[PDB]
Amino acid sequence: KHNMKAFLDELKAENIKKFLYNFTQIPHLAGTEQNFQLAKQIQSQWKEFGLDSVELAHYDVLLSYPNKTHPNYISIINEDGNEIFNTSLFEPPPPGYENVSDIVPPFSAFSPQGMPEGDLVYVNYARTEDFFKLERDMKINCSGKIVIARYGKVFRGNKVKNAQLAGAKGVILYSDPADYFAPGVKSYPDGWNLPGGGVQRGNILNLNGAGDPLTPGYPANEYAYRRGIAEAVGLPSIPVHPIGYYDAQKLLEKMGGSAPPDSSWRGSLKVPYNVGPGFTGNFSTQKVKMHIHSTNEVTRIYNVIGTLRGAVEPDRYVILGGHRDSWVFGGIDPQSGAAVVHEIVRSFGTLKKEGWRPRRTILFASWDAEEFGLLGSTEWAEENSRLLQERGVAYINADSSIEGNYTLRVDCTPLMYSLVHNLTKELKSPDEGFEGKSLYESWTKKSPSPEFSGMPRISKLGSGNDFEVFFQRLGIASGRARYTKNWETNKFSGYPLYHSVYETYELVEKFYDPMFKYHLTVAQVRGGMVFELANSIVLPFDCRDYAVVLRKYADKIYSISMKHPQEMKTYSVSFDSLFSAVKNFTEIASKFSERLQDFSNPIVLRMMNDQLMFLERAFIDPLGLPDRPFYRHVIYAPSSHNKYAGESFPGIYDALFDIESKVDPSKAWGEVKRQIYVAAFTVQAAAETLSEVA
Amino acid sequence: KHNMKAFLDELKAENIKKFLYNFTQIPHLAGTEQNFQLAKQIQSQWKEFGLDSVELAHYDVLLSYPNKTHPNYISIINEDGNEIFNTSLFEPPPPGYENVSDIVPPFSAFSPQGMPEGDLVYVNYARTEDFFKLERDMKINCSGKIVIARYGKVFRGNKVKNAQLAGAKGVILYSDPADYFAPGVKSYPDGWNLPGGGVQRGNILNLNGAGDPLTPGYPANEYAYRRGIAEAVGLPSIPVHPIGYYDAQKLLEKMGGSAPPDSSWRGSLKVPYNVGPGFTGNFSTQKVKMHIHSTNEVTRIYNVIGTLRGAVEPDRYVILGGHRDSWVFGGIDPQSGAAVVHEIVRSFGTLKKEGWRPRRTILFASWDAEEFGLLGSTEWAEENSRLLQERGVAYINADSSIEGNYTLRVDCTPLMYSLVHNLTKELKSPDEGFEGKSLYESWTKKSPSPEFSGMPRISKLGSGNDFEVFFQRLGIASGRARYTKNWETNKFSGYPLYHSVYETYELVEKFYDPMFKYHLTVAQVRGGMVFELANSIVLPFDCRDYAVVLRKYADKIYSISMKHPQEMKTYSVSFDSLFSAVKNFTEIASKFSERLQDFSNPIVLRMMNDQLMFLERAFIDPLGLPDRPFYRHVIYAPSSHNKYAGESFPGIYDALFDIESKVDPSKAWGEVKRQIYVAAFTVQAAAETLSEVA
Numbered sequence A, B: 001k002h003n004m005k006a007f008l009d010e011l012k013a014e015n016i017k018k019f020l021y022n023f024t025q026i027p028h029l030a031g032t033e034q035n036f037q038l039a040k041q042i043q044s045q046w047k048e049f050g051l052d053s054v055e056l057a058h059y060d061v062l063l064s065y066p067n068k069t070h071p072n073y074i075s076i077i078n079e080d081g082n083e084i085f086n087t088s089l090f091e092p093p094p095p096g097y098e099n100v101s102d103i104v105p106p107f108s109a110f111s112p113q114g115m116p117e118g119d120l121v122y123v124n125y126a127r128t129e130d131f132f133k134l135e136r137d138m139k140i141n142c143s144g145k146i147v148i149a150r151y152g153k154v155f156r157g158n159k160v161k162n163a164q165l166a167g168a169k170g171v172i173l174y175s176d177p178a179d180y181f182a183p184g185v186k187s188y189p190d191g192w193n194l195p196g197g198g199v200q201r202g203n204i205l206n207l208n209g210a211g212d213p214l215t216p217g218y219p220a221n222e223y224a225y226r227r228g229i230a231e232a233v234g235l236p237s238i239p240v241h242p243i244g245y246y247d248a249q250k251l252l253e254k255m256g257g258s259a260p261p262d263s264s265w266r267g268s269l270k271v272p273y274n275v276g277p278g279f280t281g282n283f284s285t286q287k288v289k290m291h292i293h294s295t296n297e298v299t300r301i302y303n304v305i306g307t308l309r310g311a312v313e314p315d316r317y318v319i320l321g322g323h324r325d326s327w328v329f330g331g332i333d334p335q336s337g338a339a340v341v342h343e344i345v346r347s348f349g350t351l352k353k354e355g356w357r358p359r360r361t362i363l364f365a366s367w368d369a370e371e372f373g374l375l376g377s378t379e380w381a382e383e384n385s386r387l388l389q390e391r392g393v394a395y396i397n398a399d400s401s402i403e404g405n406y407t408l409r410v411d412c413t414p415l416m417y418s419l420v421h422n423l424t425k426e427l428k429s430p431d432e433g434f435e436g437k438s439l440y441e442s443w444t445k446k447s448p449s450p451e452f453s454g455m456p457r458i459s460k461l462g463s464g465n466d467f468e469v470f471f472q473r474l475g476i477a478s479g480r481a482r483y484t485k486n487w488e489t490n491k492f493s494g495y496p497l498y499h500s501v502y503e504t505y506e507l508v509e510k511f512y513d514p515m516f517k518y519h520l521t522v523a524q525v526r527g528g529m530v531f532e533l534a535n536s537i538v539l540p541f542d543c544r545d546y547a548v549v550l551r552k553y554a555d556k557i558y559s560i561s562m563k564h565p566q567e568m569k570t571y572s573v574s575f576d577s578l579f580s581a582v583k584n585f586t587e588i589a590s591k592f593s594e595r596l597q598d599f600s601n602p603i604v605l606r607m608m609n610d611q612l613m614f615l616e617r618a619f620i621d622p623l624g625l626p627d628r629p630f631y632r633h634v635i636y637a638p639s640s641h642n643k644y645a646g647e648s649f650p651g652i653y654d655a656l657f658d659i660e661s662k663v664d665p666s667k668a669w670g671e672v673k674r675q676i677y678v679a680a681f682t683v684q685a686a687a688e689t690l691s692e693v694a
């Protein structure tokens, strides 16, 4: 029998281990020759594995690299202009790798060049609320200052945006032990903690879903017209550089000026965490100087696109995609994900060689340049947007399988909730103490839903990974699942060795997943979801789950607005239309579900499958959200304060955010009402896609 | 047998005559009670006729009306401020109607209020090239002048836009006998010519596809947030008013200043057609004064939406739509079209009562407020855009059936060319001297194709009618057909009595179509097209016809650019990518056609029907054209100089237009190249929708 169980049983932990080892011996930085050779290897193996067609799709996109002969670093400079302390030029390499070539030194991708010199201001996590606290409560002015910020809590691109708007002339990012050093665990190579010389690489763009900065809207193909750099999307205007906590301590220890406002501003280093500006008395004439010489360069990138043609509905696509480029070795990010994709392809291929085909087409993708701003997935989706629009059933992401090893972490559209619950009830938990129990049981126990007893938490999709173009721009039902450390305490900061040279195969094999059983569990969740989406006669989406969350989100946005009852009275701000739309959606969805349960007729089936497939699509507004034309989903968007976090009714949320500070309340409240109208209309329009069609 | 022939034979000229009489006894101005009662009558009759469901869809949109107690008029005013000549306050009513109430006096809908006073400049047809001739060649400055322009050649909204940009402080539009009085035919009521007191009503908006000025993007429903008037879309900034040629002669006869530059500037009145500014010597102290007091008012409008549910593919929609609102009696425009729709519904209904249903759903629409800017169709399409997007097969328009009585006039997507040729070969010509010949024969003889022997001319879709939102915004294959006077000599000006009180039932019955045989022929063309689109197993679209015109349009735009060979060399402007895309489209379309001819398998069929249906959809760019976000089709758009005319590769055309006048040639030629890239990419993307799907 070829069924989901034959598919799942063919997946092997030992294969995933072998592939991870294979993918992590050398760096695979986007745009480099070694990542192109890995692309060719994956292409060859996916063909061997039995896919019908496997092609490279290449694009020429803006990337960023340090200058090999003019290294980036930061100094403390004295009165005379002598540089009395310099930050490191590279991370000390881990045991046995001290001779590996082509390890990119730590840098912030897309930083402009510059050598600014000035006084430091410490801005905590550089969040919106941290700048509010500084400027409004403490009366500290960041204008013309170098800001130093600890990594964590929010996407680092948002930190840089916030610093820029505060008037900073440069940004220094660092990893604080409070966020990247778990109590009682040893530093790499003897445990999974970040050493004092470890540094987190990463891009600091604010693309808002644009993809390659030079070609928003259109694929960066051979004949593409490119914007000039000055009109590029999302580039920071001030130099930025990341450092580790040994170097951070040298920069922070001299800081003077104002005390930190409270303990949420203090990390774990033995320093006061003074906000500044500048250093204490004796050192008041010393300054901090950055030296950034990185260059932005249009560079070729390669996606691998594998097709397994559907037997019955070849014009319906279920996509399993995850990236292949890494900052250095990519032991976790992304190769722990890519090795899982590889074993999934191998398994689907085994069935195919025995004569099976999925009902719908499955596309498999190895995306390039994810780390430089989701460039590979976004360019390919721009190239193929018409096919994806009209044929795209679902997208399942596949980055890092093991953020941690504590429990499952799922984020997806409501349309996939039932599917995820059902599937995880049929999978075995890999967790210690849950042997012979289901994955659903261990997951629900460790990550309970805040609103329902006996259900697990499932979070919202924002961005920070390759599902973004499919879900936020194109409105294709999307999901992701991975093992994680602890949703409660660390959602957005990364595991300690994130984007560092220390994130290696040995890190994984020794400290995360020696038996590869967590990797296997994640392969079964991702592979099983793809299997059901591609093979179930009726698409495995439950529109009623959308109705339930729409109500929750409406209650939520209404409660936010209700912090301002006088203004709601003055400007006649009513949420009645939105509640009415949500009520209608609930009623129509329930009737559609009855019909779906109550119909031999393939046209009715496919008509109904089309209504299911286009339901996510109905939440797209072709005008996009305000000043974010590539975020088109009206129910969800990446948070404007933290690209990693999903926000619900984003148009209304952003219109209400900090509204008491707006100088023209009439205008501001007018925009809140406009967004309520857009949201009510889009919800009712989506509901009406589920009505009888004629 | 229920086949197209049973459908066609049931249509009767006498029914169309009875319905036209019924629809034209009183005015049916948009937003008035009499047009709401007509909507209710049509709703009732379409139900009687046998439609499954017939509903009113209402919206509250910005309309415009004269002030009943403060009439609009124009004066010549002397030195002292005495008004020595006044234009008429109404058209003398035709025989037997001199007691009919609620005839709206001539006015330009959406004119702002004002009473500007100044010297006249005569600007011919107020076209782009007429303002070029005035400002660049003749050195005449329109700033602070009242412009007087003759109607004709281009949409009157473009005239007003051009006058505004030239700095005019008001616009007077008039009907010149050269354009509205055919030699040797009598004036109404004794023939079909415009009398000296006749005046053409009409809106002067520049909406660019927005629909209701207050709610661009979203339907104007009960809870809609409306822009303030100052942010409304498309309103003119200067007063405008239309007059007849008796009144025009009084304004033109005194004109002085410069002679007309040549004979293409002279109409048929006994006046010099001096450009001005101002009057000749003796009258140099006299001025022209406008008095406009019209008001814009949000008003309810009603579409009638009739559904005939498909037997096999109810989730596939073929739409037959045309408007019902008229300026006054609407003898031709639109009731000669609406009476045809009515008989078509009646005929489809007769078959339905005998047990037949079309394969696909047919929707029938009676649109409101077309005359005020396509408001009814556009609001309804905004409300239903998700259903239309994913289910819309085709839209067939149905305004005026008889612009004239000489030959057929068709404008449609290339996808419908074969269908139109095939159908007209099976219909009888109604034309004198072609008895027993096909409609194809008489049409091809009277309106030959400029590029192919033995084929008829079929023109491009622009705007100026209700297909605009379906085709230019949504990318649904669209077509229209009507009898006309003479494409060669009058494409865009209207028949003489257009939008005047004289356009009555008697006009039609006496002077256009006494036997209603032209109306019947048009009913058979429109009804037959709807029948084939709704019933043919394989959609009746030939993608190869698109490949042929894409090449023609590419050759055309390339030849325009090639007027500037030095700049093409300097800025490396290549059309190679576009020709390559068109070549690929041609190759892929040919292979798809072979497969379409070469496949019992309904999924392959519907997969192939979906590829046919989504082909027009693939030409939509979700970013829209530059500064025209509701014109999204990359191959076609309404001309930026004349909304009535279709333009091909509009993005490139507009980037090249008057490019030798641009002050930064580097920037201008950069934009030409950007548009070439967008066009090549969109053509290749559309081609790829026709490739094998996996």
Ligand SMILES: *[C@@H]1O[C@H](CO)[C@@H](O[C@@H]2O[C@H](CO)[C@@H](O[C@@H]3O[C@H](CO)[C@@H](O)[C@H](O[C@H]4O[C@H](CO)[C@@H](O)[C@H](O)[C@@H]4O)[C@@H]3O)[C@H](O)[C@H]2NC(C)=O)[C@H](O)[C@H]1NC(C)=O
Residues within 6 Å of the ligand: A577, A578, A580, A581, A584, A680, A681, A684, B222
């Ligand atoms: C959720 O679904 C329900 C349908 O079950 C849908 O109800 C509709 O609501 C609209 C707006 O409230 C109703 O609109 C009315 O329609 C009648 C004609 O049928 C008009 O006469 C009404 O206008 C008068 O009253 C207004 C309100 O005070 C005045 O402002 C106006 O000037 C007129 O005097 C009004 O337009 C519509 O009939 C129902 N349809 C039904 C019950 O079938 C509701 O809109 C959906 N929610 C959303 C957010 O779409």
Ligand SMILES: *[C@@H]1O[C@H](CO)[C@@H](O[C@@H]2O[C@H](CO)[C@@H](O[C@@H]3O[C@H](CO)[C@@H](O)[C@H](O[C@H]4O[C@H](CO)[C@@H](O)[C@H](O)[C@@H]4O)[C@@H]3O)[C@H](O)[C@H]2NC(C)=O)[C@H](O)[C@H]1NC(C)=O
Residues within 6 Å of the ligand: A222, B577, B578, B580, B581, B584, B680, B681, B684
């Ligand atoms: C019409 O359809 C044809 C397919 O039949 C399609 O042809 C494609 O054209 C592109 C662009 O010309 C080809 O791109 C090349 O691909 C190879 C790898 O396969 C690259 O090595 C090439 O890059 C090198 O050469 C460039 C050109 O001088 C250099 O600028 C570059 O730096 C590299 O050195 C190049 O990207 C592609 O292979 C074909 N595909 C085929 C033949 O199958 C054509 O693009 C379609 N037209 C449109 C408008 O889409």
Ligand SMILES: *[C@@H]1O[C@H](CO)[C@@H](O[C@@H]2O[C@H](CO)[C@@H](O[C@@H]3O[C@H](CO)[C@@H](O)[C@H](O)[C@@H]3O)[C@H](O)[C@H]2NC(C)=O)[C@H](O)[C@H]1NC(C)=O
Residues within 6 Å of the ligand: A418, A419, A422, A540, A541, A542, A597, A598
């Ligand atoms: C997740 O699993 C649940 C539980 O198995 C699935 O719900 C069940 O789905 C079946 C199949 O449609 C339902 O059976 C139907 O029952 C009605 C009678 O009530 C009958 O009319 C139909 O012919 C059919 O037998 C069943 O009621 C339903 N059970 C529930 C809701 O408790 C659910 O569909 C799965 N989710 C997926 C696949 O996305």
Ligand SMILES: *[C@@H]1O[C@H](CO)[C@@H](O[C@@H]2O[C@H](CO)[C@@H](O[C@@H]3O[C@H](CO)[C@@H](O)[C@H](O)[C@@H]3O)[C@H](O)[C@H]2NC(C)=O)[C@H](O)[C@H]1NC(C)=O
Residues within 6 Å of the ligand: B418, B419, B422, B540, B541, B542, B597, B598
């Ligand atoms: C308009 O009318 C023309 C002429 O009738 C239609 O073209 C014809 O379409 C038929 C049906 O597909 C073609 O027949 C096919 O012939 C091939 C052999 O060459 C065979 O493989 C198929 O099984 C089938 O019999 C026919 O060739 C074709 N004739 C032409 C192009 O001259 C055309 O389809 C009509 N357009 C519409 C309906 O939009």
Ligand SMILES: *[C@@H]1O[C@H](CO)[C@@H](O[C@@H]2O[C@H](CO)[C@@H](O)[C@H](O)[C@H]2NC(C)=O)[C@H](O)[C@H]1NC(C)=O
Residues within 6 Å of the ligand: A021, A022, A025, A040, A041, A044, A045
């Ligand atoms: C990763 O695995 C691949 C596939 O087995 C290895 O590439 C193969 O290497 C052998 C021996 O050098 C060649 O004969 C094959 O042509 C390669 N197959 C390909 C590229 O598909 C590769 O050596 C492994 N890499 C590492 C670092 O272990």
Ligand SMILES: *[C@@H]1O[C@H](CO)[C@@H](O[C@@H]2O[C@H](CO)[C@@H](O)[C@H](O)[C@H]2NC(C)=O)[C@H](O)[C@H]1NC(C)=O
Residues within 6 Å of the ligand: A067, A068, A069, A070, A295
């Ligand atoms: C990277 O930095 C190097 C080293 O300083 C740069 O190479 C110098 O470039 C200048 C002109 O731009 C030459 O005159 C020097 O002789 C070069 N010096 C050396 C030591 O090679 C190079 O420009 C930078 N690379 C970039 C910007 O991509």
Ligand SMILES: *[C@@H]1O[C@H](CO)[C@@H](O[C@@H]2O[C@H](CO)[C@@H](O)[C@H](O)[C@H]2NC(C)=O)[C@H](O)[C@H]1NC(C)=O
Residues within 6 Å of the ligand: A081, A082, A083, A084, A085, A086
């Ligand atoms: C930090 O790095 C800088 C740059 O290499 C060092 O300063 C240079 O020192 C050399 C020789 O000692 C001078 O000839 C250069 O002119 C200096 N360059 C600059 C830009 O100042 C500095 O010594 C290092 N500081 C420490 C404490 O190691």
Ligand SMILES: *[C@@H]1O[C@H](CO)[C@@H](O[C@@H]2O[C@H](CO)[C@@H](O)[C@H](O)[C@H]2NC(C)=O)[C@H](O)[C@H]1NC(C)=O
Residues within 6 Å of the ligand: B021, B022, B025, B040, B041, B044, B045
């Ligand atoms: C146009 O035709 C309609 C439909 O026959 C006429 O409306 C009907 O009039 C009769 C007699 O007054 C009523 O009993 C019916 O209820 C009406 N039917 C409807 C509204 O569906 C209408 O009178 C005709 N109008 C003109 C101007 O001739």
Ligand SMILES: *[C@@H]1O[C@H](CO)[C@@H](O[C@@H]2O[C@H](CO)[C@@H](O)[C@H](O)[C@H]2NC(C)=O)[C@H](O)[C@H]1NC(C)=O
Residues within 6 Å of the ligand: B067, B068, B069, B070, B295
């Ligand atoms: C249309 O014009 C009439 C007539 O002049 C306007 O009615 C006058 O309005 C003013 C105040 O706006 C009153 O004080 C006058 O007494 C009215 N005069 C008469 C004769 O009724 C009316 O405002 C206009 N209608 C509009 C603008 O919709």
Ligand SMILES: *[C@@H]1O[C@H](CO)[C@@H](O[C@@H]2O[C@H](CO)[C@@H](O)[C@H](O)[C@H]2NC(C)=O)[C@H](O)[C@H]1NC(C)=O
Residues within 6 Å of the ligand: B081, B082, B083, B084, B085, B086
């Ligand atoms: C054109 O119309 C105007 C407005 O009705 C006429 O001028 C008015 O004449 C009356 C009485 O004769 C005066 O009391 C008003 O003050 C005038 N109004 C204005 C605005 O001037 C004028 O007579 C008409 N001209 C002709 C030739 O008929």
Ligand SMILES: O=C(O)CC[C@H](NP(=O)(O)OCc1ccc(-c2ccccc2)cc1)C(=O)O
Residues within 6 Å of the ligand: A202, A203, A333, A370, A371, A372, A373, A374, A399, A403, A404, A463, A464, A465, A484, A485, A490, A491, A492, A493, A494, A495, A643, A644
């Ligand atoms: O440019 C962009 O939008 C994104 C490009 C890139 N995506 P990535 O680094 O491949 O994945 C982001 C990420 C976010 C949070 C965590 C995490 C891990 C463990 C515990 C808690 C949270 C891990 C990873 C980036 O963000 O730099």
Ligand SMILES: O=C(O)CC[C@H](NP(=O)(O)OCc1ccc(-c2ccccc2)cc1)C(=O)O
Residues within 6 Å of the ligand: B202, B203, B333, B370, B371, B372, B373, B374, B399, B403, B404, B463, B464, B465, B484, B485, B490, B491, B492, B493, B494, B495, B643, B644
């Ligand atoms: O606002 C808008 O876009 C359009 C609203 C409205 N559409 P309409 O008047 O109902 O139809 C436009 C029209 C254009 C040309 C001709 C014609 C007739 C006979 C011979 C040659 C040409 C007839 C009609 C209008 O244009 O005012």
Ligand SMILES: *[C@@H]1O[C@H](CO)[C@@H](O)[C@H](O)[C@H]1NC(C)=O
Residues within 6 Å of the ligand: A141, A142, A143, A144
């Ligand atoms: C911050 O400092 C600069 C002066 O260097 C000034 O232009 C800016 O207005 C200041 N902002 C505030 C809020 O004081």
Ligand SMILES: *[C@@H]1O[C@H](CO)[C@@H](O)[C@H](O)[C@H]1NC(C)=O
Residues within 6 Å of the ligand: A192, A404, A405, A432, A485, A511, A512, A513
């Ligand atoms: C993985 O799980 C083990 C054993 O349960 C635990 O000791 C270890 O700390 C975990 N690794 C990480 C990175 O959390």
Ligand SMILES: *[C@@H]1O[C@H](CO)[C@@H](O)[C@H](O)[C@H]1NC(C)=O
Residues within 6 Å of the ligand: B141, B142, B143, B144
């Ligand atoms: C037209 O006239 C006004 C002066 O009343 C002036 O502002 C404008 O620049 C003039 N334009 C030209 C081209 O002379």
Ligand SMILES: *[C@@H]1O[C@H](CO)[C@@H](O)[C@H](O)[C@H]1NC(C)=O
Residues within 6 Å of the ligand: B192, B404, B405, B432, B485, B511, B512, B513
């Ligand atoms: C209609 O056709 C007749 C007879 O052929 C012709 O005399 C008349 O002028 C035509 N009417 C119009 C409006 O062209």
